[PDB]
Amino acid sequence: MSLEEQRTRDELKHKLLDLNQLTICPSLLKLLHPETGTVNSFYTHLKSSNDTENNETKSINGKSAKEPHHSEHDNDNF
Amino acid sequence: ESLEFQRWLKQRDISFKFMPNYPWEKAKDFLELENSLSINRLSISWRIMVSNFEPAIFIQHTPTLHGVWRCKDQYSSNQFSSLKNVCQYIEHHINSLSRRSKKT
Amino acid sequence: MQELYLLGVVPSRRFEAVVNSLSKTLDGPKTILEFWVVYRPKDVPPNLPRQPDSWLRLCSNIESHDETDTEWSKNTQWSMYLEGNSEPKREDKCGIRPVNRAKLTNGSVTEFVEKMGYEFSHEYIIQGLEYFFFDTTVRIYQTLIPSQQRSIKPPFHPMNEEQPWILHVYTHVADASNQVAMAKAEANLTKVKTLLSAFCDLKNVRL
Amino acid sequence: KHAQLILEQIRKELHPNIFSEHVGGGLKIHVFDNEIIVKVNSVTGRLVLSLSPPRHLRAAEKNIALNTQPPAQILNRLYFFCIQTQLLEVAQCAELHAVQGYYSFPYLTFSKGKWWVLAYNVESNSWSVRLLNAAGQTLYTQDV
Amino acid sequence: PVHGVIYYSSPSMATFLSPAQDNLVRTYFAQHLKKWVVQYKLYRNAVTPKTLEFLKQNINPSMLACVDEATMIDAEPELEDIIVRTKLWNFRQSFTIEGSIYEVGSFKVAIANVLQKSVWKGILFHVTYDGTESVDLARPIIQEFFLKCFLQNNKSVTPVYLDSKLLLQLFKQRID
Amino acid sequence: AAPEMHLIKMNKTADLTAILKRILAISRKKXXXXXXXXXXXXXXXXXXXXXX
């Protein structure tokens, strides 16, 4: 249902796969499933470590490092 | 100057944070205040806030006396002359950041 | 770097009393602590430069360093000097010796003079006091011989522990070509000589 | 008397565009308007920015310490340069890079981010969209 | 932060093609090999040699490589030259590296015309870029911009890793 | 080409046109508000202005 929003996080996980194009991360996708239980190219320029985040209505923190993926407590997921 | 910032945002009650880290906070002896009043660069970050889930446009600010307003967002860092430049820049936010957030 | 300078012995018995006539009226006191190695470039053929200056002088300032700490020998600041000799016909006049004030930055330090192959020779330690007058300064001497080669541990070895205080006013010219700093600093330090003359008798010595 | 004679000296060595007044040497590197004064006694002139000034005064006045090369067109350097920094701050959003390689004129290049080439020029400021290569077909406005 | 200086058989164009690029510019990128030869023999090679090159990394350290080839000590003097001049030491045909490093963006391109004592040698190119990636996640993709602007007649020499490493890497082209 | 008195062809946003805008054939008319039934009419008044 709301998992499509998490799918965007999965798309963010796909962005990590896109970062792979540039394992435990799959477990992070499982964490996105746990979330299911409950432009940006300029941000890449900021990564060109950096910072980014998801919104509406979940503050996943897609900060670049690898990268952060913390949910929003701080929920310091990567 | 920082008062001008704070008064500038008292105008509109947006959340923001003055963040001092003074040398004169420190003085292990009376001779360290002697070094505590150096003209050296002094960070004073600000944290303007109305956006929720997204992290603040965190700011670098080191108003060295001589020899000093460079923010950073998720896009690009930018030095500003007047604090008024910061103000109007966040006005470019009060329009365009709002619109770009609407398109997200 | 054309150093301009004089020399005058101070017996230790009157030393600190002189310091009262000095440091209260001057910058400092600053204790000196610097380990020398005056390596001699034994070389062929004659005529060698052979002069004492021609022999190399690595100059490890260590005054802030511990008397027993082990990292010193190639981590604490070093230097190097050949230096020109003081001028001929410099009678009574402050000696003028041009100076190459070398500096260095690597874990390797001494090694390059032996990369130049130069042999070890005599060694000591500046250990006197120095009192500023802008670019000019006085440098009263203490040059104890170190207790062992490459050993920073005291007691060291003055030729007598009734050690002479080889008082030594000086300055360091950037370049000798102009008359400016010549007569200027010679005048200022001659007045410094008038100051010491209230308690000492400096003289030029050939170098 | 000599002082106001210098005030008119540079003022008539200066451009009409920038009205130097006796109110206090109001140099007019627009938007900013700032003081021009020569120091009483020992020189290093007391020209002043309107709050805290940076190197500009320091540069013109240490240039006075240099004495050589009288300042007038140099004031024009101050004008175009401080304005350069101003526009650089205006160059931030809409990254009009104004890279100067394609011509080295005092007229000064304006450019664009990201970028066969279609040029971009303004001066008075006057919005003369002079896209060029060479010289492409253009369009012009005088707004603002 | 991989290094990758490249020698080229098609010079001149760096002064010409890079400005022709529509993008942004920074500052100087010049450095100088200085071969040495002791006025007598004895000190001929290795640890105690005729060989020496103070290396003018002018861009940042302003510190010479006080190096008798693979003899690691560094210093600004200069005064050391005169110290070395105690009835001693000469030179040999070293080739200086000078140029033209410019701001770009995610990466930036150091540029330098190269100069033998016989006037010319041949231009070198370099591009600094973020170092968190493994050596070739994008380095060839960076070299897409070695083909943009297109670059021609490159020498095979490949020094590899901030930029202090380039000092030893100078030898990689110096020993040639 | 052009061909026809039809104009816009339009883009954002507010401006004091002089370059200008809302061109019919080639030359601009700066009639951003012009109706599809009145854009060609704007090009007709522009034709009235075309005498010099």
From Swiss-Prot, chain A:
Q: Which domain of life is it from?
A: Eukaryota
Its localization reads: Nucleus
What is the documented function of this protein?
Component of the Mediator complex, a coactivator involved in the regulated transcription of nearly all RNA polymerase II-dependent genes. Mediator functions as a bridge to convey information from gene-specific regulatory proteins to the basal RNA polymerase II transcription machinery. Mediator is recruited to promoters by direct interactions with regulatory proteins and serves as a scaffold for the assembly of a functional preinitiation complex with RNA polymerase II and the general transcription factors.
Q: Subunit notes for this chain?
A: Component of the Mediator complex.
Q: Which family does it belong to?
A: Belongs to the Mediator complex subunit 27 family.
- Protein's recorded name: Mediator of RNA polymerase II transcription subunit 27
Encoding gene, per UniProt annotation: med27
Q: Which residues of the full protein are shown?
A: 1 to 134 of 273
UniProtKB/Swiss-Prot annotation, chain C:
Instruction: Work out whether the entry's keyword set contains Transferase.
Output: no
What InterPro entries is this protein classified in? Mediator_Med18
Q: Which GO terms describe its biological process?
A: positive regulation of transcription initiation by RNA polymerase II
Q: Which UniProt keywords apply?
A: Activator, Nucleus, Transcription, Transcription regulation
Q: Does the keyword Nucleotidyltransferase apply?
A: no
The record's subcellular locations are: Nucleus
Q: Where is the signal peptide?
A: none
Any single GO CC term annotated in Swiss-Prot or TrEMBL for this entry: mediator complex
GO molecular function terms attached to this record? transcription coactivator activity; transcription coregulator activity
Q: Which family does the similarity line name?
A: Belongs to the Mediator complex subunit 18 family.
Q: Which PANTHER family match?
A: MEDIATOR OF RNA POLYMERASE II TRANSCRIPTION SUBUNIT 18, MEDIATOR OF RNA POLYMERASE II TRANSCRIPTION, SUBUNIT 18
Subunit field text: Component of the Mediator complex. Interacts with med17, prk1 and rbp1.
Function noted in UniProt:
Component of the Mediator complex, a coactivator involved in the regulated transcription of nearly all RNA polymerase II-dependent genes. Mediator functions as a bridge to convey information from gene-specific regulatory proteins to the basal RNA polymerase II transcription machinery. Mediator is recruited to promoters by direct interactions with regulatory proteins and serves as a scaffold for the assembly of a functional preinitiation complex with RNA polymerase II and the general transcription factors.
Return the protein name: Mediator of RNA polymerase II transcription subunit 18
| Species for this entry | Schizosaccharomyces pombe (strain 972 / ATCC 24843) (Fission yeast)
- Tell me the organism's taxonomic lineage: Eukaryota, Fungi, Dikarya, Ascomycota, Taphrinomycotina
The gene from which this protein is expressed is: med18
Swiss-Prot record, chain E:
GO MF terms, alphabetically ordered: transcription coactivator activity
One BP term from GO = regulation of transcription by RNA polymerase II
Record's keyword annotation contains Ion transport = no
One annotated Gene Ontology cellular component of this protein = nucleus
Q: Which key words tag this protein in UniProt?
A: Nucleus
The record's subcellular location field reads: Nucleus
Q: How does it assemble?
A: Component of the Mediator complex.
Q: Which family does it belong to?
A: Belongs to the Mediator complex subunit 20 family.
Function, in words: Component of the Mediator complex, a coactivator involved in the regulated transcription of nearly all RNA polymerase II-dependent genes. Mediator functions as a bridge to convey information from gene-specific regulatory proteins to the basal RNA polymerase II transcription machinery. The Mediator complex, having a compact conformation in its free form, is recruited to promoters by direct interactions with regulatory proteins and serves for the assembly of a functional preinitiation complex with RNA polymerase II and the general transcription factors.
Name of the protein this chain belongs to: Mediator of RNA polymerase II transcription subunit 20
- Taxonomic source organism: Schizosaccharomyces pombe (strain 972 / ATCC 24843) (Fission yeast)
Swiss-Prot record, chain F:
Q: Where in the cell is it found?
A: Nucleus
Q: Which residues cross the membrane?
A: none
**Superkingdom to which the source organism belongs:** Eukaryota
Its family remark reads: Belongs to the Mediator complex subunit 14 family.
Q: What does this protein do?
A: Component of the Mediator complex, a coactivator involved in the regulated transcription of nearly all RNA polymerase II-dependent genes. Mediator functions as a bridge to convey information from gene-specific regulatory proteins to the basal RNA polymerase II transcription machinery. Mediator is recruited to promoters by direct interactions with regulatory proteins and serves as a scaffold for the assembly of a functional preinitiation complex with RNA polymerase II and the general transcription factors.
Q: How is the subunit organization of this protein annotated in UniProt?
A: Component of the Mediator complex.
Q: What is this protein called?
A: Mediator of RNA polymerase II transcription subunit 14
Gene that this polypeptide is encoded by: med14
